Amino acid sequence: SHMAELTPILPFLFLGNEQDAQDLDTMQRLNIGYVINVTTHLPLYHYEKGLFNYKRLPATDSNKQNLRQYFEEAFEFIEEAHQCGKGLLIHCQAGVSRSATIVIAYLMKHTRMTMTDAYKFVKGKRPIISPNLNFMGQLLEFEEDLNNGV
Numbered sequence: 001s002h003m004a005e006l007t008p009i010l011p012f013l014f015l016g017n018e019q020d021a022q023d024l025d026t027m028q029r030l031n032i033g034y035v036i037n038v039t040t041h042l043p044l045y046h047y048e049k050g051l052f053n054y055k056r057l058p059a060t061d062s063n064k065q066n067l068r069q070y071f072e073e074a075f076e077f078i079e080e081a082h083q084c085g086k087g088l089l090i091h092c093q094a095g096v097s098r099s100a101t102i103v104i105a106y107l108m109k110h111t112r113m114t115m116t117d118a119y120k121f122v123k124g125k126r127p128i129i130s131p132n133l134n135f136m137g138q139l140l141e142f143e144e145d146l147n148n149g150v
């Protein structure tokens with residue numbers, strides 16, 4: 001059986017892959033009440049139990065997928081979890097390329113880290129991250145917009 005690793009990037013912000021997202025017991029142990037599913041094809045796990053608030057960012061792992069368009073919507077959901085003292089899990093698939101992009105963007109905007117420091121911070125807690133040059137380029141443009149206040 002799979003040992004579910006729900007990585008706490010921040011005490012209320014967790015990152016995982018598709019198999020980590022299927023462990024209901026771990027999610028309730030960690031006081032998680034919000035889930036962001038960054039895939040088009042995965043089910044919203046545990047949906048039928050009425051335990052969590054869900055948000056789907058229907059993105060693919062392609063070199064042309066636009067994730068920047070979903071940043072603000074994801075940040076608003078994370079902020080709602082933060083304000084009510086609940087944890088939020090963001091997940092995609094094995095290499096966590098999609099979900100780690102949104103986590104890093106949140107750290108850049110709301111923790112005021114640089115892109116590099118945010119990546120290193122996430123990488124230290126979640127060692128296995130599949131690179132995506134397209135998403136990396138979007139984070140670099142996101143950093144410049146933040147540094148310019150746009």
Ligand SMILES: CCCc1scc2c1-c1nc(SCC(=O)C(C)(C)C)ncc1CC2
Pocket residue numbers: 096097098100101104115116119129130131132133135136139
């Ligand atoms: C976000 C900046 C990534 C940077 S800045 C300098 C390096 C890297 C880096 N990142 C990765 S994985 C991270 C991603 O690509 C996302 C999360 C977008 C999916 N693999 C290898 C390297 C080599 C060195």
